Paper text:
We therefore used nucleotide analog ATP-AlFx to trap the complex more in the closed state to facilitate a high-resolution structural study. In the resulting dataset, the majority (65.4%) of the particles were resolved to a closed-state TRiC map at 2.9 Å resolution, while the remaining (34.6%) particles were resolved to an open-state map at 4.2 Å resolution. In the open-state map, obvious substrate density was observed in the cis-ring (denoted as TRiC-tubulin-S2). For the closed state, through focused classification in the chamber region, we obtained two maps at 3.1–3.2 Å resolution: one map showed tubulin density in the cis-ring chamber (termed TRiC-tubulin-S3), and the other map showed no substrate in the chamber, but a central tail density in an orientation different from that in the open NPP, S1, and S2 states (denoted as TRiC-closed, discussed below). For the closed S3 and TRiC-closed structures, the nucleotide densities for all subunits matched ADP-AlFx and a magnesium ion very well, in addition to a water molecule attacking the γ-phosphate of nucleotide, involved in the formation of the ATP hydrolysis reaction center.
Numbering used by the authors:
A (entry chain e): 78 to 538
B (entry chain a): 254 to 354
C (entry chain N): 249 to 347
D (entry chain O): 234 to 388
E (entry chain M): 50 to 441
F (entry chain L): 7 to 529
Write the structure that this text describes.
């Protein structure tokens, strides 16, 4: 959302966009890491090193950081009862956002929203099944995980019942009207017997479209298109509530959450194509006139809906962006069940691996690998700067403790939680999240180091 | 039309209905015909052949002052109790001399 | 084109060729009505099609095409003719003899 | 082990030749036209069915009617495919693109082994794999910038 | 300077170029368009006086302009404005008790009491020299449409005011019938005695439906069956009207199709029937209450019971701005009346229209509250002396 | 980013003018509506530069902020905060704006004290949790004994209307607000109470109608009043139907058949009205327009016809008469009709309105607001809307707290008691949270002209040792008991003032960089 007209800084926008499209957790850390590799390459440029020689030295240095990151990695997620590694992984992503008041409540929402929609046989998660809706009012603690769908209810009759206990949902895609063809007709009326046949044709058509729903045993109808006024009163006489003007992908989520089928016509309705749902009701929020749908009970649904509430639209649109990062880190655990320990613990441990292999051998790329290890320490020392500590005082203590003994999950924190052990503080990050942070920042540095000319124009006109 | 044989009977009917009115308002003795509408070039033939004066596109305020002063009746269409073309020929105006100077 | 909303629905194969023949026969109907008085010079104010020139060619008739309206009223007094607007309503007094 | 039906036909209800005027005279024949318009589209879907073609590919769009018909019969479809991709798809599976659905047989359908819709880079991609008589290939590039992948494509 | 009988009028010329002379305080403030936000609330104060009372509307600005002027010294003496708002309510509740003791209970049957009330409101306007004619006409236009001793409300929308240029203010009329500004087509008769008036909302023209209708002509004799059957259709409509017994037709103004065609006009002229076109849809309520007619929509229900009655329905050929209609006398007249306002200029008629409405609103206040006080600065002195003793 | 700026027309600031423009723009919003808080606060008059300025005086803080159009980026968060407060509870939009501004004013005092801004966020989260327990433990519930609940509802409407233009009308407008929600007898739809504003008369002349008022008067030749009638409403088309077959023409061969079709069209329109009068009704309400051909049929049968009332006008008539919409007339045994006593027409402000006097099952009301100017009627409508929305939620949540500064000192006492059990890093941020809660009775006390430095000091000394119901008495200017005077507010209103201001001050305090983009068409 910047208006930066600089082609070097425009590549940093696409770098943070590429992290969001692939993983979606380290979009902030991939820009500080790329700016750290270029700052260490500035002093290497004054010493006479070629910029491609620094870029070839960063590839031999980032390869050590990938292989060292795969040393300690284990998870015991079974998606049945061992959701405790899944909650603590989402708390690391949600801990940096403004949802720390709901740090335990909203973390359990994003865990159960993924496991109910993910295909564990293919390890594929579809985010189209997870509907993220937001409405102003209430508080952040009123955010609930609604198993089902939440749409804008548009009961055409104001005397419609606003609560269905056991809903046999009849999903249809045909408007409540006489059937209009797709071509030009220009139907001819000649005598008065043909005009009286027009009245009996539509009178029996509205009685046919209503009886074919009641013969299937349905007590709720969903329609994509509009309703006629003559069809509205026939819904109240037959005790058949129905909504009007639902969107495109909204009714696609109803047929999965209720187990029904979307029927094109009225003649193809049957008892097997009906959906099953429990508490179907509309809830008015304060003084507004929205009346969104709340689906409490279901039966083996593969589609959930998160209803985010708040005090203003600034806290809701951020929570839509904060919880989407929490939905992505659970998706990355199904793609790869290996984790690391964040809080700067993985960056200090990877900086020691490049420094150990810089002496094996220090032929040409010795200075390029030490500039990579000094730039990997910028991310944990930025956590020490934002926490009110000292960067060079705190980083020297943590890095020295990993050499004197075997290197544990040793990082830092804000309130510091007592000890600096990341295994005890439950700061868990994904392996492929930090694996793509080092891989994308190295390749973006190589495309901005291997450039020796700028051919930009002058004024606009 | 659904048959090409009935094409020329409709094309000639647009002028035969027109010439039907012009022959029953002229055979009753009318010599001066004033019209506030429009007399096209086809209808001007029936007055030159019969020797009648036809004045076209006159004012609506001038027609009322002539018909009231000469005893004529300001007629707009066909009338008089489901008649085809009657024109009520006893309600024609009179004049001593109509001369263009 | 007539002063109406005439539109023909052509369903059979013989209907389109019949309309193009009725357009030729309509010109031959009015050209046969003007040669019953045996004229020599036909003078009009509007256009003359090539099919109307074909019947006047073999009947040895000299046709003038686009004479003005003010020139037609002047030749009507010189030759003693009457300007008619209907070919099937021609009479012997409408022919300008004495020229 | 799916079969691919490469098509050049519209699977919509509104398939009109833009010159048809269906003049009706009575209300008994008026309902017969609307029932015939659904029977025209459903007859095309029965030609794709009963042939093993679980995957449908067409360069012309597919409406909401034929999308829900394949979901009930457990069949996959993909509409508005570019013509450069269907030419590569024809040489991959070894089939042929059939504009008319009446001439569908076992000699015009494709054959592959693995057909999934992955989530590479956030966007979905329907990839075909496993066909040994593949006269073509597809090299998917993954990079960190749009100008980075354009240089990788140029290289 | 625009208050009282010795006050002068004001003329406000707007940006469009329509300059009007006005003396009523509600009409002045709506045309001045004051840009100050505190002065626009005084415009809406005189607007609600025209709605509730009608005759209080320069005086509500003199009071509210002086109550705030008295608050100039009050705010420079350390008095909080909430204390001034509490004390102004106590002076208001004591002020109504002083005006109630000065009130005299009257009855609407006394015409001389209602005549002096309407003459008082006309003394400040331009029609003070015409109080011998307009003030008797203002009482008779109210006391015949209220049905007194049975209701405490009166709608002024049942009193139509027709503005016509020509003559003087002495040429005003209080015709109790219907006055229409439309012309008569055809105008060959323009007078009928013992007339029966019928309101027709049907369109006397060619047959057409709400659905799209077309005529198929595919025969030589089929063109004869189009024109001659359309003439026989409207002939059945005119003969259905003529056999009812009516002489005056009122056709509602149609927008979709043509209401009265040229073919339908010729049959109605031969039946000696006066036809009036272009009657608005918002004016049919005033017509049916005055004459007593009923709105006839379909031609099958056009019977003699839905007609009206008129002793004289003629088009009065005026010497001024054209001519109008004037129905004189009707069986069982409703609670409606029409006032014809004349004038030498277009500016005097707009002032005479506002002065008549200021005169009808005075008698409107006597229906709601049958009490009156002395005028000419009389109750303002008693409100000044009794509240001074109340303040001590 | 200022040094070697790579932006075209956009500017930004980081940690120097970011919190400077955020604290200036948010305090100036709170200091604007500071004078409108309390029962003795003045009102504002909002005006534009021209081109139909449409002046609208409002005392409620949501309507002031939604029309000013602030150019400050951080001030729009407090504008959007008061918009949600009006949409959720309908009250406290001014109280949530001053409280969110006093938190950032105390946070500006922590600039020179070199306190980390994340420590103030962690200090205010523990302060807000202690303030939720103060309101929850002091909430007074009301179950049975309904003669004390109706007296409690008059204290809610008396507290809300005291801070508005209806100052010396609490003997009348409290009964107009309590009995309006009491006649709903169900859900707070907040649309059955149709407020009609008419000029002329004082605010004491306003009243609550026992029936229902409407416009679009009864036909031309139809009766104006029918005693003991059966009301049937409708939502169907009367004339020019063009019934649901797009692409259907009348293709005939002669003009005599067109006269047979248009007579057959009017026979089907006559047969539709004949199906309506088989129910045995005397009044007819259609949402759509009624043309002249069915209007003559209702007038000949002695049936009323109210044409084109409103889209939401048939909903209020269905709740005040006890019928149904009934857009299809083919089953008279399955259509429930309304009930009334008098359908006479009344005249309010020289306008004839249809009065539905004596209706049965009347779950709808009509408030006839009469005022001196249009500016008073626009203010009294929003003042009544701020009172009916709280009573529609007080019947759903019967928990009430003692207002008038008593609830704020209870919340500030629970924070100060837990500020002494904390280390000195977060205890300074908790003391600034308690000082901002004491500013809300300080604004109320200083708006009347009282000694605000001593009255809040007497409230803090009272709440420190007992006196859980002690508050500010704005009548005499002293400290009194809130249970005796009857100054109470709803629990959900006072919770949303505390919770939304704590969340909105959390967002602005966490901003260290304001990067605004280049605007369009601004040169
Ligand atoms: N409790 C904690 N203790 C220490 N460090 C933490 C803690 N929680 C989060 N962090 C650190 O904060 C950083 C936040 O990175 P983030 O901005 O979310 O990356 P991205 O922008 O890719 O989502 C992580 O790298 C993590 O190491
Ligand atoms: N004959 C009279 N003698 C003395 N005073 C009069 C006479 N007639 C009218 N007035 C005064 O002229 C004033 C006119 O007030 P007006 O402008 O009509 O008030 P509003 O604007 O409210 O209608 C009245 O207050 C009345 O006292
Ligand atoms: N009778 C009273 N005694 C003491 N305080 C009162 C009284 N009436 C109202 N108040 C106070 O005046 C304040 C008015 O706040 P208000 O502007 O209505 O907030 P909002 O704009 O959110 O509705 C309330 O916080 C309340 O405590
Ligand atoms: Mg994060
Ligand atoms: Mg006066
Ligand atoms: Mg309030």
């Amino acid at each position: 959302m910047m208006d930066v007209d600089h082609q070097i800084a425009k590549l940093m926008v696409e770098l943070s966009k590429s992290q969001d499209d692939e993983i979606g957790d380290g979009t902030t850390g991939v820009v500080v890491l790329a700016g750290a590799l270029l700052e260490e390459a500035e002093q290497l440029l004054d010493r006479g090193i070629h910029p491609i020689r620094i870029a070839d030295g960063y590839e031999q240095a980032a390869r050590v950081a990938i292989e060292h990151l795969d040393k300690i990695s284990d998870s015991v997620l079974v998606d049945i009862k061992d959701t405790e590694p899944l909650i603590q992984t989402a708390k690391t992503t949600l801990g940096s956002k403004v949802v720390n008041s709901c740090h335990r409540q909203m973390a359990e929402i994003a865990v159960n929203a993924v496991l109910t929609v993910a295909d564990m046989e293919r390890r594929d998660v579809d985010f189209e099944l997870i509907k993220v809706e937001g409405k102003v009012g209430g508080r952040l603690e009123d955010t609930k995980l609604i198993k089902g769908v939440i749409v804008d209810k548009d009961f055409s009759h104001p005397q419609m019942p606003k609560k269905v206990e056991d809903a046999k949902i009849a999903i249809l895609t045909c408007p409540f009207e006489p059937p209009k063809p797709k071509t030009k007709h220009k139907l001819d009326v000649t005598s008065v017997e043909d005009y009286k046949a027009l009245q009996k044709y539509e009178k029996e058509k509205f009685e046919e479209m209503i009886q074919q729903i009641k013969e299937t045993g349905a007590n709720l109808a969903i329609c994509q298109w509009g309703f006629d006024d003559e069809a509205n009163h026939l819904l109240l006489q037959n005790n058949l509530p129905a909504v009007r003007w639902v969107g495109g992908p909204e009714i696609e989520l109803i047929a999965i959450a209720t187990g029904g089928r979307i029927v094109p016509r009225f003649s193809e309705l049957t008892a097997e194509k009906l959906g099953f749902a429990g508490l179907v009701q509309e809830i008015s929020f304060g003084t507004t006139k929205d009346k969104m749908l709340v689906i409490e009970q279901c039966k083996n649904s593969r589609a959930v809906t998160i209803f985010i509430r708040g005090g203003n639209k600034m806290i809701i649109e951020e929570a839509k962006r904060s919880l989407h990062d929490a939905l992505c880190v659970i998706r990355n655990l199904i793609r790869d069940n290996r984790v690391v320990y964040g809080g700067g613990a993985a960056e200090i441990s990877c900086a020691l691996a490049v420094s150990q292999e810089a002496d094996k051998c220090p032929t040409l790329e010795q200075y390029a690998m030490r500039a990579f290890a000094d730039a990997l320490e910028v991310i944990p020392m930025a956590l020490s700067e934002n926490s009110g500590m000292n960067p060079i005082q705190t980083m020297t203590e943590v890095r020295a403790r990993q050499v004197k003994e075997m290197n544990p999950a040793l990082g830092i924190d804000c309130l510091h939680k007592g000890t600096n052990d990341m295994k005890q503080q439950h700061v868990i990050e994904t392996l492929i999240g930090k694996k793509q942070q080092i891989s994308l920042a190295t390749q973006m540095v190589r495309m901005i180091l291997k450039i020796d000319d700028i051919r930009k124009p002058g004024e606009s006109e | 039309i659904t048959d090409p044989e009935k094409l020329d009977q409709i094309r000639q009917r647009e002028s035969d209905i027109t010439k039907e009115r012009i022959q029953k308002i002229l055979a009753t003795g009318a010599n001066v015909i004033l019209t506030t509408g429009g007399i096209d070039d086809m209808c001007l033939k029936y007055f030159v052949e019969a020797g009648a004066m036809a004045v076209r596109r006159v004012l609506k305020r001038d027609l009322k002052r002539i018909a009231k002063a000469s005893g004529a009746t300001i007629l707009s269409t066909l009338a008089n109790l489901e008649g085809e073309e009657t024109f009520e020929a006893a309600m024609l105006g009179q004049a001593e001399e109509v001369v263009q100077e | 084109k007539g002063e109406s909303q005439t539109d023909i629905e052509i369903t059979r194969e013989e209907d389109f060729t019949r309309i193009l023949q009725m357009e030729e026969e309509y010109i031959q109907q009015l050209c046969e009505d003007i040669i019953q008085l045996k004229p020599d010079v036909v003078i009009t104010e509007k256009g003359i099609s090539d099919l109307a020139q074909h019947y006047l060619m073999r009947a040895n008739i000299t046709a003038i095409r686009r004479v003005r309206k003010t020139d037609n009223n002047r030749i009507a007094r010189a030759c003693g003719a009457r300007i008619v607007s209907r070919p099937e309503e021609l009479r012997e007094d409408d022919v300008g003899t004495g020229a | 082990n799916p079969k691919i039906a490469l098509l050049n036909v519209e699977l919509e209800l509104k398939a009109e030749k833009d010159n048809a005027e269906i003049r009706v005279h009575t209300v008994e024949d008026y309902q017969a036209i609307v029932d015939a318009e659904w029977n025209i589209l459903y007859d095309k879907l029965e030609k794709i069915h009963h042939s093993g073609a679980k995957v449908v590919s067409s360069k012309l769009p597919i409406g909401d009617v034929a999308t829900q018909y394949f979901a009930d019969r457990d069949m996959f479809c993909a509409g508005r495919v570019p013509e450069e991709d269907l030419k590569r798809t024809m040489m991959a599976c070894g089939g042929s693109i059939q504009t008319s659905v009446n001439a569908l047989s076992a000699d015009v359908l494709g054959r592959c082994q693995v057909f999934e819709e992955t989530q590479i880079g956030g966007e979905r991609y329907n990839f075909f794999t496993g066909c040994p008589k593949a006269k073509t290939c597809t090299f998917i590039l993954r990079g960190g910038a749009e100008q980075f992948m354009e240089e990788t494509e140029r290289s | 300077t625009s208050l009282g009988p010795k006050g002068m009028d004001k003329m406000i010329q707007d940006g469009k170029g329509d300059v009007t002379i006005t003396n009523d305080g509600a009409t002045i403030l709506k045309q001045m368009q004051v840009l100050h936000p505190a002065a626009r609330m005084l415009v809406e104060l005189s607007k609600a006086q025209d709605i509730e009372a009608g005759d209080g509307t320069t005086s509500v600005v003199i009071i509210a302009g002086s109550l705030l002027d008295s608050c100039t010294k009050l705010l420079q003496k350390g008095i909080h404005p909430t204390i001034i708002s509490e004390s102004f309510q106590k002076a208001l509740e004591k002020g109504i008790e002083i005006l109630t003791d000065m009130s005299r209970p009257v009855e609407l049957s006394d015409r001389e009491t209602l005549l002096n009330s309407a003459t008082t409101s006309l003394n400040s306007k331009v029609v003070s020299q015409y109080s011998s004619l307009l003030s008797p006409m203002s009482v008779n236009a109210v006391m015949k449409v209220i049905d007194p001793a049975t209701a405490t409300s009166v709608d002024l929308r049942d009193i139509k005011i027709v503005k016509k240029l020509g003559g003087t203010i002495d040429d005003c009329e209080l015709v109790e019938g219907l006055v229409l500004t439309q012309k008569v087509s055809n105008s060959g008769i323009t007078r009928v005695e013992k007339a029966k008036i019928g309101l027709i909302q049907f369109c006397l023209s060619a047959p057409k439906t709400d659905m799209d209708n077309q005529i198929v002509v595919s025969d030589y004799a089929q063109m004869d069956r189009v024109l001659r059957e359309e003439r026989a259709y409207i002939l059945n409509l005119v003969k259905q009207i003529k056999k009812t017994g009516c002489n005056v037709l009122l056709i509602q103004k149609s927008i979709l199709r043509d209401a009265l065609s040229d073919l339908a006009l010729h049959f109605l002229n031969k039946m000696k029937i006066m036809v009036i076109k272009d009657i608005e849809r918002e004016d049919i309520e005033f017509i049916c209450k005055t004459i007593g007619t009923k709105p006839v929509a379909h031609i099958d229900q056009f019977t003699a019971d839905m007609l009206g009655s008129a002793e004289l329905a003629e088009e009065v050929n005026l010497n001024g701005s054209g001519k109008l209609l004037k129905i004189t006398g009707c069986a069982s007249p409703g609670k409606t009346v029409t006032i014809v306002v004349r004038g030498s200029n277009k500016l005097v008629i707009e002032e005479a229209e506002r002065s008549i409405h200021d005169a009808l609103c005075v008698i409107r206040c006597l229906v709601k509250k049958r009490a009156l006080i002395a005028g000419g600065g009389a109750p303002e002195i008693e409100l000044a002396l009794r509240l001074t003793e109340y303040s001590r | 980013a200022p040094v070697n700026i790579f932006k075209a027309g956009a500017d930004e600031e980081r940690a120097e003018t970011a919190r400077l423009t955020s604290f200036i723009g948010a305090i100036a919003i709170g200091d604007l509506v500071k004078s409108t808080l309390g029962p003795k606060g003045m009102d504002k008059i909002l005006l534009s530069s021209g081109r139909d300025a449409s002046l609208m005086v409002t005392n409620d803080g949501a309507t002031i902020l939604k029309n000013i159009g602030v150019d400050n980026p951080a001030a729009k968060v407090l504008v959007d905060m008061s918009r949600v407060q009006d949409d959720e509870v309908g009250d406290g939009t001014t109280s949530v704006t001053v409280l969110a501004a006093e938190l950032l004013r105390e946070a500006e005092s922590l600039i020179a004290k070199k306190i980390h801004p994340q420590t103030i966020i962690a200090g205010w989260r523990e302060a807000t949790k202690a303030a939720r327990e103060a309101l929850l433990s002091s909430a007074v519930d009301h179950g049975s004994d309904e003669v004390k609940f109706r007296q409690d509802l008059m204290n809610i409407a008396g507290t809300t209307l005291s801070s508005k233009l209806l100052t010396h009308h609490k003997d009348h407008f409290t009964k107009l607000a309590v009995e309006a929600v009491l006649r709903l007898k169900g859900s707070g739809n907040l649309e059955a109470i149709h407020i009609i504003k008419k000029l002329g008369g004082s605010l004491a002349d306003s009243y609550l109608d026992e029936g229902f008022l409407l416009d679009k008067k009864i036909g031309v030749n139809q009766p104006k009043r029918i005693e003991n009638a059966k009301i049937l409403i409708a939502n169907t088309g009367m004339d020019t139907d063009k019934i649901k077959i797009f692409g259907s023409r009348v293709r005939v061969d002669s003009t005599a058949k067109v006269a047979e079709i248009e007579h057959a069209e009017k026979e089907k329109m006559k047969e539709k009205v004949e199906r309506i009068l088989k129910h045995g009704i005397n009044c007819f309400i259609n949402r759509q327009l009624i043309y002249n051909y069915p209007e003559q049929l209702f007038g000949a049968a002695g049936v009323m016809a109210i044409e084109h009332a409103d889209f939401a006008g048939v909903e209020r008539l269905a709740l005040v008469t006890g019928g149904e919409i009934a857009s299809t007339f083919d089953h008279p045994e399955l259509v429930k009709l309304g009930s009334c006593k008098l359908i006479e027409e009344v005249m309010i402000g020289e306008d004839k309105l249809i009065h539905f006097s004596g209706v049965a099952l009347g779950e709808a009301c009509t408030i006839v607001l009469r005022g001196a100017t249009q500016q008073i009627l626009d203010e009294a409508e929003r003042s009544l809307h701020d009172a009916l929305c709280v009573l529609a939620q007080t019947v759903k949540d019967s928990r009430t707290v003692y207002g008038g500064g008593c609830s704020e000192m209870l919340m500030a006492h629970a924070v100060t008691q837990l500020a002494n059990r904390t280390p000195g890093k977060e205890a300074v941020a908790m003391e600034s949270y308690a000082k901002a809660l004491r500013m809300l009775p300080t604004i109320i006390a200083d708006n009347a002209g009282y000694d605000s430095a001593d009255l809040v000091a007497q409230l803090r000394a009272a709440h420190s040792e007992g006196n859980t119901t002690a508050g500010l008495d704005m009548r005499e200017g002293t400290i009194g008991d809130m249970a005796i005077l009857g100054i109470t507010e709803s629990f959900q209103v006072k919770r949303q003032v505390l919770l939304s201001a704590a969340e909105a001050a959390e967002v602005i305090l966490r901003v260290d960089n304001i990067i605004k983009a280049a605007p369009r068409k601004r040169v």
